[PDB]
Amino acid sequence: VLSPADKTNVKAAWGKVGAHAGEYGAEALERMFLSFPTTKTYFPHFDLSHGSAQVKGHGKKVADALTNAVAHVDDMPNALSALSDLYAHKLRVDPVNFKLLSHCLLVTLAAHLPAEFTPAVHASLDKFLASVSTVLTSKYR
Amino acid sequence: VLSPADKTNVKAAWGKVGAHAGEYGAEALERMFLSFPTTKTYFPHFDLSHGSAQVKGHGKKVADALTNAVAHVDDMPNALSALSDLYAHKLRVDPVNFKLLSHCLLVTLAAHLPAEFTPAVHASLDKFLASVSTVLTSKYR
Amino acid sequence: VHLTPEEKSAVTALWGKVNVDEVGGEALGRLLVVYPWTQRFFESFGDLSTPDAVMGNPKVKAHGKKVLGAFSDGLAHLDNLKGTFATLSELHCDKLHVDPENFRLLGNVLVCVLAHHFGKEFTPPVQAAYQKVVAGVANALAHKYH
Amino acid sequence: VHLTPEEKSAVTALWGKVNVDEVGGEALGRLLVVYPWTQRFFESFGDLSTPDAVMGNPKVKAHGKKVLGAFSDGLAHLDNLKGTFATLSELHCDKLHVDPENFRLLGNVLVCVLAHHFGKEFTPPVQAAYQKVVAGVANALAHKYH
Ligand code: HEM
Ligand code: HEM
Ligand code: HEM
Ligand code: HEM
DSSP: OOOHHHHHHHHHHHHHHGGGHHHHHHHHHHHHHHHOGGGGGGOTTSOOSTTOHHHHHHHHHHHHHHHHHHHTGGGHHHHTHHHHHHIIIIIOOOHHHHHHHHHHHHHHHHHHOTTTOOHHHHHHHHHHHHHHHHHHTTTOO | OOOHHHHHHHHHHHHHHGGGHHHHHHHHHHHHHHHOGGGGGGOTTSOOSTTOHHHHHHHHHHHHHHHHHHHTGGGHHHHTHHHHHHIIIIIOOOTHHHHHHHHHHHHHHHHHOTTTOOHHHHHHHHHHHHHHHHHHTTTOO | OOOOHHHHHHHHHHHTTSOTTTHHHHHHHHHHHHSGGGGGGGGGGOOOSSHHHHHHOHHHHHHHHHHHHHHHHHHTOTTOHHHHHHHHHHIIIIITOOOTHHHHHHHHHHHHHHHHHHGGGSOHHHHHHHHHHHHHHHHHHHTTOO | OOOOHHHHHHHHHHHTTOOHHHHHHHHHHHHHHHSGGGGGGGGGGOOOSSHHHHHHOHHHHHHHHHHHHHHHHHGGGTTOHHHHTHHHHHIIIIITOOOTHHHHHHHHHHHHHHHHHHGGGSOHHHHHHHHHHHHHHHHHHHTTOO
8 A cells, every 4th residue: 555655755756757757658668678578579569669759659658647646646546447447458468567667667767866766765666656557457357 | 356256166166175274275385385495485494394294284374364265255355454464564475475375276276176176266266366465465565 | 497307207207198189278278267368369269258168169279289289399308498499489479479477377377287187196296396397398488589 | 697798898887886885785775665574584683664764774784785795796707697606595595594586676676776876877778787687696596495
């Protein structure tokens, strides 16, 4: 469960991300494709080269879903319900992969926001990303 | 979530386990220690040899907790609340290990109760054991 | 992955008793029932809408036999699983785009099917040996991903 | 796992600029904060009840120096990680009873600490090389478990 401190920490860190959310989403995806090549199996229809427009566009979608979840941190299941339906019925990404992207999102935030990425904030962001991932896979079976 | 059919399937399969629950729990632990030796790191104080009295006693503890969870399948978080407290504050078994025991419990049931272990019941049992595991680690951080 | 000589003998002996017409389809079918999102990879297989439809689907049974034959090839080459599965690894990556995490799921489902088929004879030491086999097969099938 | 020669060069170049003492205390502290169940192994270190208590704990810092010093020594033998870490693997299994999953958690925390310290220099390709390193170290430290 996200504590009061987790919510404060996530809102503060993601607020500092600000206009860079989509760029950081694309960077996290690129980090994941390079570090964990099995994740590319879900994107046979994508140009996965550095800077590709498809990865940029997808990073914006990922980042927007995270921004919305931050704005709905009190009830993420409800805010992410439609996306979780799409995952269960169509996208069907194995749960292990969300841990890989979550780790790459932490790395991306750490590499861009050194003042914000304190140990406590790192802990809260990891809980938040794991909670989002749980919702996304919650209707799989 | 556990569907009405899942709950019916789990109650039927575990009901048939019946008085063998402790023995089957001990067999599942033995299967786990032999197949996944890293799980032995949580029992350095145990004799883990075949037929161990400590393994038999622990199998009964695991099985009785599962029997309680089955009897309270509509509200497992509440029924397991003291156990999840103890896990988060003391036992602190890494979450990966619960998947290993859950798999070994499925193998044990398949080897013992072939009429119960249909594909649908296998699916329901796997969901149920994953739900129990989620409750057990729900307070970890 | 390293099986002891006793483990190799036990795995080989049990495998000789496997129903080659049914065990592979039962493992594939149970994968599709227990982890129903894996049906994404088999849309061309027709009716997968209920557990009974999955397990009775002739394409599930037929494909499962081919999967079982590849497992048999691995069991005959336990010291070279990577070489045995290199061609299928490239296929599952480059042609079929299958996340190799699914190979772990299928391996453990196969272990469940072996326990179901063999009962008492699928002892805890025999299972431990087969866990080494299915992990080695999954690793070998994942090895040529890039 | 195995690194390309370009990956080896990138690993060695970045590591030459790591304050191993400081980074080890930071990585171990972050492990205990982010995954607080890992505190089970370190009761003798005293107060680990808040992030500030963990990160400032002098025993966490002193132990982190030893952990990352051993990690640093292993980088001298990237082609023989299992051999280099065999004694430490036996120790963590037989004497310390540490589930090797913890090595994977610490490896990814270390990656986060490197990204935090280096910023943009920790590029996606540099991360990919370090992911191979930390996975190889974790696998090596798990290898003598039995
Ligand atoms: C923080 C975790 C993630 C979030 C918030 C997220 C969010 C999203 C969103 C909002 C979409 C668009 C859905 C729509 O069309 O309405 C999407 C699509 C997609 N995602 Fe996820 N995603 C995450 C992780 C992942 C991971 C780990 C993978 C696979 C390794 C993945 C694979 C995909 C794929 C294949 C699509 C479809 C893309 C396309 O066809 O254009 N995502 N994601
Ligand atoms: C279905 C999953 C499981 C259930 C229902 C379960 C249940 C229990 C129960 C009821 C206890 C006794 C708690 C008390 O003292 O009140 C216990 C203790 C314990 N369990 Fe779990 N357990 C499960 C899985 C696991 C796994 C996978 C591991 C490790 C790999 C594990 C390791 C332990 C340990 C080390 C203890 C303390 C034993 C001792 O020192 O005597 N358990 N468990
Ligand atoms: C882990 C052990 C596995 C083995 C030994 C194996 C083996 C095989 C073999 C022998 C073929 C036929 C290749 C050919 O005729 O050229 C095949 C095809 C295929 N495999 Fe696998 N496989 C495994 C796991 C999986 C899993 C877990 C999935 C998906 C969840 C999968 C997805 C597929 C698909 C989609 C095809 C093509 C089926 C078709 O449309 O004809 N495989 N596999
Ligand atoms: C890169 C991974 C790791 C390396 C290289 C490493 C290395 C070491 C070394 C060199 C020692 C000192 C041994 C001695 O002085 O004889 C040690 C001790 C120890 N390690 Fe690890 N370690 C790693 C990960 C871990 C993790 C993740 C945990 C638990 C979460 C852990 C638990 C312990 C404990 C409890 C001790 C004994 C500490 C004490 O004296 O109180 N290690 N480790």
